[PDB]
Design a protein around this ligand. Structure first.
Ligand SMILES: CC(=O)Nc1cccc(-n2c(=O)n(C3CC3)c(=O)c3c(Nc4ccc(I)cc4F)n(C)c(=O)c(C)c32)c1
Ligand SMILES: Nc1ncnc2c1ncn2[C@@H]1O[C@H](COP(=O)(O)OP(=O)(O)NP(=O)(O)O)[C@@H](O)[C@H]1O
Ligand SMILES: Nc1ncnc2c1ncn2[C@@H]1O[C@H](COP(=O)(O)OP(=O)(O)NP(=O)(O)O)[C@@H](O)[C@H]1O
Ligand SMILES: [Mg+2]
Ligand SMILES: [Mg+2]
Lengths: 277, 304
């Protein structure tokens, strides 16, 4: 029923809380000092024992993680109703912002390199039986070659879906969801109960591979309902409209494969990205 | 496309035009909620409705949305609601409008049981003239026709609202709301090129819903049709695309009405009736030349 910060392998004396880093749908995310840190303050119902040991469920799984492509989970003190998840602070910019700045060149060699980094980290999380469930370019950080995944596992305890028989759909969420997930979104959908999987995470990587080369999300033109139906029945773009070769386009056909068992694991995907020009 | 008793109040709208000048927040005092609010302007005693669209977004883009929005001062007709001004205050752009005493036709439907054919006769002309006006006078299609965006008043006018003026405002709102009642045309869900034909389908679907008192997909089983007189988003949209369209029950509605909705709900947008094909249709030429006190029907059913 309680998590203390003395329970962690990172010796902790004091924790300073600075300015808000940015807006976001899941709690608030402040600058902090410990070394410099990133603090995410989440609030929970006072007496929802289910949500809580299901949070505790998650965090000490994270206590076993350390990998150069995965943000360093540092600690999580929990004196309900106020929670906190404390991780290393990322220098540099998010992949979302880098992709959408015209002053940065993103040649085919660089995009292969960024993608292999994300894959290595995702393979580590998968190897430890941890699903990301929200892999996307706002959750990847890029500082002159250094690439770091963040926010893995949070989506289960997130509550970002929460109107009357109306599901709230953020821009760019849907085009990451593999078809098995899209086909059951409903106004009763709970983040706890969607069928995420290792295969769903590979799909979400595919969306990032599209985004690295087109420098925008797929289905940019289209409204949410059109995206749901188009992705549910298996319709997907290629990148020949911008002169990308076959190899780059084949990556998508594998990652976005309609039947899950046809998409590669991250280990196989790591090989496929090696054999590019 | 002309009448003198509606040239009367178009122009008396442009006399309350001068009274507004420019607008920002503290001019307005909230009265009640209807998200949009009932407001009371202070420099000008006009009672309006104020939209709130929460957007969290750049310098240059706002200026170019509000100036893209300024097209609504120009458009004027008895089948489109009244536009006053657009400004930005506190992370939320706010469109101020003509207020409507009766509410949306979704509003009136849930209070009534069903809506009679003779009234939705007149509703149909209001929509078809509106869409015809906007296309050939401004080269814009509505893009979002549904019962909640057709508004009515105790004076007796029916006009459309919440249509697409600003190609950017579409792009800038961060998240949409997807429920169990969809009015998107089958061609729009598949990502095919579309025209005002899509707005005609949206009209057809709204009409059958209002005539029956229930959203018509999936269609009801014989047990619920007798009475009247758990589904995931994807399979509803897939129903719209692959199963045959809904139709009114053969018993209780006239042939002219049934053929009207049937032509609006044809899947192939080329075979679907176009705007003015619909205006020479038997059902609305019959309905045009009828006397129904719309104001009286409204005030007796919602109570005002
Ligand atoms: C992909 C796609 O089709 N997007 C789309 C398609 C159609 C509509 C919208 N859109 C919308 O949905 N609303 C609804 C949600 C409240 C709007 O109010 C809305 C809006 N306001 C408004 C307009 C006119 C009058 I007279 C009063 C008003 F208040 N204007 C000015 C718009 O230009 C758009 C483009 C709006 C978005
Ligand atoms: N470890 C970190 N280092 C630096 N910035 C961070 C870190 N974690 C989060 N941020 C930033 O803090 C803000 C909020 O992050 P977050 O709450 O995950 O929202 P988001 O993932 O960017 N968008 P969304 O989850 O779809 O609502 C964003 O500006 C992030 O870039
Ligand atoms: N000018 C108006 N006068 C009276 N009621 C209005 C007016 N504008 C909106 N409403 C009502 O406000 C409520 C919410 O409208 P709105 O914010 O547009 O969402 P919605 O109608 O439920 N679906 P949508 O219009 O697509 O966002 C509905 O009950 C409308 O009838
Ligand atoms: Mg994030
Ligand atoms: Mg509306």
């Amino acid at each position: 029923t309680s998590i203390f910060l003395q329970e962690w392998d990172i010796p902790f004396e004091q924790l300073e809380i600075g300015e808000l880093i940015g807006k976001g749908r899941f709690g608030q995310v402040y600058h902090g000092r410990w070394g410099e840190v990133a603090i995410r303050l989440i609030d929970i119902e006072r007496d929802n024992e289910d949500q809580l040991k299901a949070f505790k469920r998650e965090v000490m799984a994270y206590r076993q993680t350390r990998h150069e492509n995965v943000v360093l989970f540092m600690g999580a003190c929990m004196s309900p109703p106020h929670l906190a998840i404390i991780t290393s602070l990322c220098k540099g910019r998010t992949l979302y912002s880098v992709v959408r700045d015209a002053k940065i060149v993103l040649d085919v060699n660089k995009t292969r390199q960024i993608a292999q980094e994300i894959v290595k980290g995702m393979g580590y999380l998968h190897a430890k039986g941890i699903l990301h469930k929200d892999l996307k370019s706002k959750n990847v950080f890029y500082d002159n070659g250094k690439v770091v995944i963040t926010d893995f596992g949070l989506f289960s305890i997130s509550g970002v879906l929460q109107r009357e028989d109306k599901l709230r759909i953020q821009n760019g969420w849907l085009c990451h969801l593999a078809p098995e997930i899209i086909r059951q979104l409903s106004p009763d959908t709970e983040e706890d109960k969607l069928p995420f999987s290792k295969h769903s995470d590979v799909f979400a990587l595919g969306t990032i591979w599209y985004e690295l080369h087109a420098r925008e999300w797929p289905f940019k033109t289209q409204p949410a309902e059109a995206i749901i139906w188009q992705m549910g029945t298996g319709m997907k773009p290629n990148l020949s409209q911008i002169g990308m070769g076959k190899e780059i386009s084949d990556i998508l056909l594998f990652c976005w494969a309609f039947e899950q068992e046809e998409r590669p694991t991250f280990t196989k995907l790591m090989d496929m990205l090696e054999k590019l020009p | 496309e002309l009448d003198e008793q509606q040239r009367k109040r178009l122009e008396a709208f442009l006399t309350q035009k001068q009274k507004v000048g420019e607008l920002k927040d503290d001019d307005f005092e909230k009265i009640s909620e209807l998200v949009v609010f009932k407001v009371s302007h202070k420099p000008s005693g006009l009672v309006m409705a104020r939209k709130l669209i929460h957007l969290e977004i750049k310098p240059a883009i706002r200026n170019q949305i509000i100036r893209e929005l300024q097209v609504l001062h120009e458009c004027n007709s008895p089948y489109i609601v009244g536009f006053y001004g657009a400004f930005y205050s506190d992370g939320e752009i706010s469109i101020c409008m003509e207020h409507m005493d009766g509410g949306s036709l979704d509003q009136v439907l849930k209070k009534a049981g069903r809506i009679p054919e003779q009234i939705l006769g007149k509703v149909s002309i209001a929509v078809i003239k509106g869409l015809t006006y906007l296309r050939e006078k401004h080269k814009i299609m509505h893009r979002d026709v549904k019962p909640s965006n057709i508004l009515v008043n105790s004076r007796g006018e029916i006009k459309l609202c919440d249509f697409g003026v600003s190609g950017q405002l579409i792009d800038s709102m961060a998240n949409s709301f997807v429920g169990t009642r969809s009015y998107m045309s089958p061609e729009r869900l598949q990502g095919t090129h579309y025209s005002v034909q899509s707005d005609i389908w949206s009209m057809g679907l709204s009409l059958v819903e209002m005539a029956v008192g229930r959203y018509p997909i999936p269609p009801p089983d014989a047990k619920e049709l007798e009475l009247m007189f758990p589904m995931a988003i994807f399979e509803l949209l897939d129903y719209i695309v692959n199963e045959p369209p809904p139709k009114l029950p053969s018993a209780v509605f006239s042939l002219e009405f049934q053929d009207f909705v049937n032509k609006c709900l044809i899947k192939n947008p080329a075979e679907r009736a176009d705007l003015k094909q619909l205006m020479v249709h038997a059902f609305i030429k019959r309905s045009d030349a009828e006397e129904v006190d719309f104001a009286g029907w409204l005030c007796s059913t919602i109570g005002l």
